Amino acid sequence: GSLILDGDLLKDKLKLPVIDNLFGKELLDKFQDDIKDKYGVDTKDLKILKTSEDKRFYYVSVDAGDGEKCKFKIRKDVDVPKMVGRKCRKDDDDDDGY
């Protein structure tokens, strides 16, 4: 589940640079069940590069250990009660959503 923004009440998101990887580790820790359910991943191994977000989504760039550096796309609870996806694709992406 998400619970990270009940019905999109985003007033205070980020006014800083890259958010602490700890915060992303917390995301991935809480959404671990989703990430593991959907994809089957361990978030404890996930090496966070850049914890951030945009609007109704979180974006946690991590090294998956697989060589891929995916930017976990945690759709906030703005609409869905879970994380929607994960913006992977290191060098050149195309999909806006995921």
Beta bridge partners of 87: 71
Secondary structure E strands in 2-93: 47-53, 57-63, 69-75, 85-87
CB 31 within 8 A of CB 43: yes
The secondary element (H helix, E strand) that includes residue 24 is: helix 21-30
The residue type found at 33 is: D
Distances, alpha carbon 45 to alpha carbons 25, 34, 51, 66, 76, in Å: 10, 16, 15, 11, 23
- Helix, strand, coil percentages (3-state) for the chain, rounded to 5, are 15, 25, 55
Burial of 29 from C-beta contacts in 10 A (0-12 / 13-18 / 19+): middle
Residue 13 burial (C-beta neighbours within 10 Å; 0-12, 13-18, 19+): middle
Structural domain spans, the chain: 1-98
Report strand pairing: 69-75 vs 57-63: antiparallel
- Domain 1-98 annotated CATH 3.10.450.260: yes
Say if residues 55 and 12 touch (Cβ distance below 8 Å).
Answer: no
